Amino acid sequence: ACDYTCGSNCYSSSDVSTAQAAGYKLHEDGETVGSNSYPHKYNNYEGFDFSVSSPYYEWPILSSGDVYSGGSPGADRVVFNENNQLAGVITHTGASGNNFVECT
Numbered sequence: 386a387c388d389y390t391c392g393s394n395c396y397s398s399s400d401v402s403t404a405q406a407a408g409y410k411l412h413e414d415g416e417t418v419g420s421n422s423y424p425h426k427y428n429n430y431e432g433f434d435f436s437v438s439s440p441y442y443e444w445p446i447l448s449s450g451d452v453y454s455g456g457s458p459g460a461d462r463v464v465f466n467e468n469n470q471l472a473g474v475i476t477h478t479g480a481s482g483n484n485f486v487e488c489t
């Protein structure tokens with residue numbers, strides 16, 4: 386069973402942990418990857434009810450199981466905060482334009 390389901394993409398807790406650790410490490414060194422510069426601030430315009438405090442940073446999680454390193458980021462993202470605490474897993478799938486919805 387999926388721990389997080391973003392549309393057709395199925396992710397386990399280890400998939401999320403691996404992605405988060407990669408993005409947080411980059412955040413710490415103050416470095417970015419990709420043309421859209423990941424990771425970067427997630428403003429939470431959607432107003433999701435997160436259990437942890439802001440600021441939030443988004444980092445893409447890939448269905449291939451690879452750690453993001455550039456190019457198309459896909460539709461899924463892991464959102465973590467300053468203390469490397471998982472805020473949630475979100476996706477562009479099933480959401481209008483460039484909005485997000487939470488993965489079930």
Ligand SMILES: Nc1nc2c(ncn2[C@@H]2O[C@H](CO)[C@@H](OP(=O)(O)O)[C@H]2O)c(=O)[nH]1
Binds near residue numbers: 425429483
């Ligand atoms: N939809 C959305 N985008 C945000 C938010 N905060 C920052 N952004 C950035 O603006 C862009 C609008 O889609 C997003 O790019 P993304 O597709 O790479 O996630 C995202 O990086 C937010 O709260 N909601």
Ligand SMILES: [Ca+2]
Binds near residue numbers: 395396397400450
């Ligand atoms: Ca997996």
